[PDB]
Design a protein around this ligand. Sequence first.
Ligand SMILES: O=C(O)c1ccc2c(c1)nc(NCc1ccccc1)c1ncncc12
Length: 326
Amino acid sequence: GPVPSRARVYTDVNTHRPREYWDYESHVVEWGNQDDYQLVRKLGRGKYSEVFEAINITNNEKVVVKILKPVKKKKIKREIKILENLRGGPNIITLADIVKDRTPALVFEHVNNTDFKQLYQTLTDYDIRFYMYEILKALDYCHSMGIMHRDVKPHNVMIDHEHRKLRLIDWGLAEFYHPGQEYNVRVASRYFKGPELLVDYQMYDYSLDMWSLGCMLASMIFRKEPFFHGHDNYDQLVRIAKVLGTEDLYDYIDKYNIELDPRFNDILGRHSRKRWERFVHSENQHLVSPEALDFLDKLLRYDHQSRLTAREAMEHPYFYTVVKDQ
Ligand SMILES: O=C(O)c1ccc2c(c1)nc(NCc1ccccc1)c1ncncc12
């Protein structure tokens, strides 16, 4: 069978807290009055929810209402408990209320958001460093509170550029870390899936988010959204293998004694690890620096234990200018 793994950091945080902190199944939910909010317009549609701009007729505060489509009550309780636990934390979206009418809905703070299609073509080298630092604050915080996001991607990072403000949203896939627990690998968007997910290693941890952040950084500095552009879950790993090389991939398999799908045996093949200069061009030259490449390299690793933590990431030279300015 596979070899066990544990997080390098924040390993036993949830064990040291009261049961009710993480035992979300036993969370009783108190439904506020749905008549307090009037829906203005639809902001977005997804698989599991719809999102609307709304007004709160009590205090005329602008608000966002996320009407949940049918999901197991367990996962609603989970998203709510995580949001309440993380409420007040740096760059974490604030859950304001919970209502229904008998479909459940989550009420959130309103945030102005620049279209990340229109925005990621206009970011300076500094802006990327800045917002990356802001994301790391959120990731380090939730990791320290014993929580994996498991869906870090451009969509779930809302940026108010005018106010240099950033919020990490959509904690519907987030889970509590527990040492020894085997998790569902069918999580995250395909382009941001860590190798642990793609090879079906279930005993993963916070470090999963750091891989996803690496995919985000890669796309930003190299101007390729997405960076690893797989046609399916199998091909996704091939795209990675064509960059990170296959030597390290198989060492990862051997180390953790992972039972690799026989399908992969055919299509992975033998690929060398590529230098990052390959993805540098005239257009993306101004965003790429020796620091950025060092930082990115230490994020994007097969072995999840060998990736940077969020706090380690924050101490990297990449962010020296940003740290000084605050
Ligand atoms: O699920 C959540 O945790 C959550 C929390 C807050 C918001 C949200 C989702 N979605 C918003 N808008 C839809 C959207 C967001 C980004 C790109 C495209 C569409 C939104 N808008 C303004 N203020 C807040 C939010």
